[PDB]
Design a binder for this molecule. Structure first.
Ligand code: NI
Ligand code: NI
Ligand code: NI
Ligand code: NI
Lengths: 81, 81
């Protein structure tokens, strides 16, 4: 399955910080067979969008939680175009 | 530049309908130098996410408007990982 998740209220995100948050997820995703495909950030609003492939939203969230940043919002996105 | 926009209230949207919306955007995006790279939809919550490339949020929204569906939110995502 695929998921879009959102982390809000981020303080002063830089490309370095985004790179590291993403790397922290990638480092431990194997333990849930999750694949963090892509992350985009809006540093002005303080928001990180994460696209992942995984068995379930719960799995994706267990990964974020271990990497110390549980997503504020997550939706399965079974449709794409 | 890069943008992520969100449409809500699309509960129960089908693959055909997402494809239709997407095609409607693509059909008029070129005039604004906008390209919709990816569209994902969650028919359960009724949430659509669109990743686009373009000169501004204004342009992207003008395209959505001509296509018949203004986005409820649009944010620039200058950072990606
Ligand atoms: Ni995928
Ligand atoms: Ni497409
Ligand atoms: Ni918002
Ligand atoms: Ni914003």
């Amino acid at each position: 399955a695929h998921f879009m998740d959102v982390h809000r209220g981020m303080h002063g995100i830089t490309s370095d910080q985004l790179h590291q948050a993403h790397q922290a997820d990638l480092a431990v995703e194997k333990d849930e067979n999750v694949h963090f495909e892509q992350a985009w950030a809006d540093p002005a609003s303080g928001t990180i969008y994460c696209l992942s492939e995984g068995p379930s939203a719960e799995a994706v969230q267990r990964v974020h939680e271990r990497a110390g940043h549980k997503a504020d919002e997550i939706h399965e996105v079974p449709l794409s175009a």
